[PDB]
Symmetry: D3
Subunit: 301 residues, 6 copies
């Protein structure tokens, strides 16, 4: 049976709009109301599902395969309105919380990074202050404002302010490019957030960074949020705010292997904007990233 | 609830892999093993479903809307192998026949036009020799050959040879471009098939051609097969064998309105090849064509 | 001096962010917060300006050329936020009103059609109830709702409700496809709006429709709003909600010639979404449409 | 044998870099040194050859097929430098003249329209003042200037000035858009050139225009020059200077049928710029146009 | 003479459909009947030839240039049917064997990787059991099946089973992603095939892997088969089954330098699918890879 | 205020066609008359400006931000004719010299690399023989010829011949691929130019190469010329002559940091050809490169 046949689900997992009893639920968040530049992330879930036919759960020289170790399912998407930022975030929180009431954790395949604040609220409600591993070209700890409380640059600002995240246990890797202001990282650092710029990542290497993550996160429940623009635009051209000089696909995938040494309670892959993608390579990468996280979840439990 | 949200089905119809009791079942045939030039029609069903979110059943100044008049469903796709032409055609016939055992008719959204021979066999088995309305830039009545019994240029040749079609009640509109040989249409015409070239269509007009169809088809059970390349490449660039100087989108959609004055027992929309499409306009058109046929089915019954 | 050289302005007109004393000001509205399906119209103004280098004011066998008859300028764009629908509409109204305080009229090159409610408010404030010529594939007279008061399907609903438009003097041409509900046009018609579907347009022809417009509009001050999706997706693939079976580019351009026989007090060209465009043909067409309106403005005065 | 197999030649004709004894030689002119806006026409010959696999010489209900009536061949390309306008034009003239020394006529598949002056010089040298049928969205009778003697807007200006063309026997169809100056057509008309704008073409129709051509050309040796941008950008997006509101593909192809009633001594299809093409539909159309001209040549002799 | 001028051949080499006496013949295999996901590799030969204009034989600081050291030619393509897998493979074998009867070796630029079994049969027939250097993201040693004996995942399975390859002298580099089953590599390894995953390649480095190849291949006649998907999708997006986290272009090109220390008797570059390519960079890379192999052939002899 | 709003200028800097008193003026050179293969670089300035909205002057953990340290402005473009190579180069020289008469230095965002000879003449006229840091995949020190005195392969040949450059103080990094002749680098090396091939760059590393630059350039006034094709086609597909196996985006950006330790008197970023770009990633990279140079200029002064 061809992998491009049949209605597309993430990695061809079974479909269940009202999942109950699974370890990890894959949930789509087709929304880009938080994008400040290029929109289009609302089609991310659809594109990612479409290309995921090429990725299975069986790695290489790994065990029996992710899906034989844990029970996963594709719960469809959250009905997020494209007309009201505040309403969409609340709907997201509500939906994500609902999932956690009957399932261990979820993997959000979405639109812009702003939606992560909803995930953090839902996950923190069930585990308490969370440790965070954030892969992004941008810090996403910028101030909100009137008529723009949830732009995709505020997710982790809210997380820290709302005590959803324990800054002393948060590490963001890949920061590069330009800050909106010269003292934009003072906030995150002042709160104890460990910032690893793309430059330092190059000095530390994958192993070095992996050790740093393990040391800063420990065994606290951790949320892994991945902004697709963390990798260089060459590997992920389909995104809203590309930033030249990013990580290689293999570097990111290799790094994520350390997640298996932690206690992940949730993750997401955001900012995929299909329209700007070339040959669907961004969606395919996004899929591979999701697959690696799902497998690491299994290894960790 | 946004139309781009949730797993995509044709026109967002309910999904049921084993449909029973419906008037018309939408079935995908993701296969391009019959394409002689550009492949890719295997992704047609997926692309068409994806863009169909923009098309509803409620026309304009029409009745209550197609889906309140008849019961339709998206039965997913036929598992067609991309490795063996003969096996795929048989699988298609078997699957399509299965659908007719518990449902009135089907609408095949597929890959290349070769698959239509399987539909004709399935439909003819339940209604006897069929009347045919074929929209295509090519006659598709060419000879088969060893190692290529079912290339997309043979569907209606088999239909006539196998007595699945009553040539005296077959009309193909839109023929233009180039025949493989100077006497290529002698076969169809010798059998009594009415050929209306794109040129003559221009002289007859939509109404004139509609009258011709009604007169040649009468009230016999009719199968309506539409090759997307019937319209000019400008309106449908996403197809395997484009042919300049074709019909306008509106001309084809207007023409299909006459189907409501007949007794349709099945139809298909083939040759959509997404990779060559621009802005998804081909898939969107293909969707609109399917919607018009579904509505005409309702009007006819 | 090459037309692709120098910072791009609409039709290479002079730039003046705070214009005063001109006949017609070209103003960009880079916003798509009202789009219900495909976003991207926020880049419309930029793309349209970019490709406008190919279009001059000198027609063919026309007079001395549009720009020697009237004084026009490119006023840049309105700073429209992508984070709040209500705030963007108010900012648009305010900015457009500002322009009318020192200039005769404006030509809004924008994002989604929802922004037209802001233009109608600004224009109506200076001329009173307006006559309207609306070219669109959709009526855009649908009900608003909580958390979505200004989706691009509500502009003319608000116009009528707010008494900004005199329905008895409004004509919309090109309607086709699907209404959200079977009784969706009852509203517009009940108010006396003349609806000319793409089908009727075909029967009436350009001349017939032009006479109808002149008769229904008279000499009342008229606002001409053009949704790029009025033309078939083949001619304008770069738009948010394509609708197959639309008008030909030449048909729309020819029709707009009748504007010179009226008293235009404003116009706009909306819904151009560059990302879905092919070869920039949509932006080029949008430019030509704007040029024709500017010229007709001159002819009318 | 698949049509996409083997090194590509125009319509899969035999290849012969030094042809002798043929009726019509297909020659490529990969050059865009004359383009004033979008470059890229230098790849036109290559793209056109590539897609020509879909077009044969056997029409529909026509005779035995073009290639059984006349002997044609693909002579490869003229080595045209992209660094010097004047040198390229001379090289073109020299090469084209060489072809005519041993073959009846040629079909130039090229780059920008400026190259036609070289063809006119070569053909006029063997037949004397020529009658001309020019299909273009622009008159191409603009003044040359220092450092730009051969921009693609000067071909027919030179033709008339150099007495290569008999203006009283020249007809250009499709003119639309914008003239560089309000009295830009005075030159052509003053010389007796019959200008049929896209607008008038609509009034005259294909038949009416065909009669006009026959009447104005008579039996004088005629050169048929076709600028691909004569058709609307929707049908030919792959060109340097698109002009909205153009002819339909079928209109142009139908019109060219009248060439068979004349005495054609040469023709060309110019301005195809592949990079801006969508789905290769422009190259495919260009191919079909060349095929129709080749067939009409045969019919005329 | 511009490199984009004249009918395109691989690296602008002379053309000869029936070559005799050359060292290396470049032969195209326009076929994708073995692709299991995205088709399109049938256009690989054409696209690769088209872009090869940018690559010459003269390296940098290398000797006199590849083409002055050995005699190469472009033999056109093998007429491979797109309708029957088994017939195409036999035709390929027959054609490739024919070439070896009068020429030293060949470089197959093709479609999907399944075609390599035909090359292995032809080469093994003249040299006996072969040593193999296989660059691919997938092992291609999967089981065949009824109605799919030659899908692109079976080439090296057949090679070993048919004794065309000496597994103890086979090395495949770049394996990554997902195996169809958790014990999928047991077969290759059980036969003594050295598998170097993309991960291990990173540890070994180019030099380390080069030493490993030299040691495992020795001086036995070796066939070098390169699947374009061995490099990360960012460098080669135009392929049927992309696999994130692949090698860098420079890594692969640098690695291939070790071929000059072996005794190459044949090579191929497969899976290039132009439709999914961006800016032709995949075809350009494929060309550069072919050039490096040709040069290494010369160095080795 | 959205960054995609308002007429686009490089990095949203103020616009001033006749700048006076600034430290660095950003000037566009929309010209590709020197391209030998793919044209299109004439749209480079426009595309780069368009995407530059994403890049600010405020780096990360850097000082107050580039634009608070120095005064920069976007001077628009040089009116370069696309019809005459020699005239365009002279116009460029004249315009660039004019800028230097009232501003410290300029950053040329242009078309093909041939234009750099004009910049070198203008800069050398005010500083004397210049030291040069050239990043390119090609040496660009090839011989000129009649009818092609300024093809993009001659810039640095002229620079040395005309004594505008002090070869003993010139370093070009990234050379790879193919030389037109086996002894093509003898010229540059014979003059004392330090050539660092992409291969050697890999051995030296960023730091090693940075030291080499500092040592070979010293404190002499230096011109930094960057050909976008220096990075692998994966990172910069939008260019005229791609060369596989190039540098990573981060490698080039990191390397340019050493410019701050020198005395830069001018720089340029050339060969960006938008049409071949994917997701605008080439233009975005080009922007980032320009930003880094501007910042390093500030650091150096
Ligand atoms: Mn983010
Ligand atoms: Mn980010
Ligand atoms: Mn067909
Ligand atoms: Mn067809
Ligand atoms: Mn609208
Ligand atoms: Mn609309
Ligand atoms: Mn022309
Ligand atoms: Mn023209
Ligand atoms: Mn393979
Ligand atoms: Mn592979
Ligand atoms: Mn260069
Ligand atoms: Mn270069």
């Amino acid at each position: 049976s061809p992998r491009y046949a049949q209605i597309p689900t993430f990695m061809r997992l079974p479909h269940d709009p009202q999942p109950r009893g699974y370890d990890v639920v894959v949930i789509g968040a087709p929304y880009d109301g938080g994008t400040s530049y290029r929109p289009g992330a609302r089609f991310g879930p659809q594109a990612i599902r479409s290309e995921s036919g090429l990725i299975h759960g069986v790695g290489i020289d790994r065990g029996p395969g992710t899906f034989d170790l844990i029970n996963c399912v594709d719960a469809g998407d959250i009905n997020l309105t494209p007309f009201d930022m505040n309403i969409a975030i609340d709907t997201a929180q509500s939906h994500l919380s609902g999932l956690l009431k009957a399932n261990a954790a979820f993997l959000m395949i979405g639109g812009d990074h702003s939606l992560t604040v909803a995930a953090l609220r839902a996950v923190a409600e069930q585990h308490g202050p969370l440790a965070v591993v954030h892969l992004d070209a941008h810090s996403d700890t910028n101030p909100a404002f009137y008529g723009g409380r949830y732009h995709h640059g505020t997710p982790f600002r809210h997380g820290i302010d709302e005590k959803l995240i324990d800054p002393a246990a948060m590490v963001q890797i890949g920061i590069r490019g330009h800050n909106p202001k010269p003292d934009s990282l003072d906030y995150a650092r002042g709160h104890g957030v460990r910032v690893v710029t793309a430059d330092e990542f190059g000095e530390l290497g994958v192993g070095g960074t992996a050790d740093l993550i393990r040391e800063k996160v420990g065994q606290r429940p951790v949320y892994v949020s991945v902004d697709i623009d963390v990798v260089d635009p060459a590997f992920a051209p389909g995104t809203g705010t590309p930033a030249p000089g990013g990580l290689l696909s293999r570097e990111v995938l290799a790094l994520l292997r350390c997640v298996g040494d932690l206690k992940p309670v949730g993750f997401d892959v955001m900012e995929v904007s299909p329209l700007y993608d070339h040959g669907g390579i961004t969606s395919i990468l996004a899929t591979e990233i999701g697959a690696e996280l799902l497998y690491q979840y299994a290894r960790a439990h």
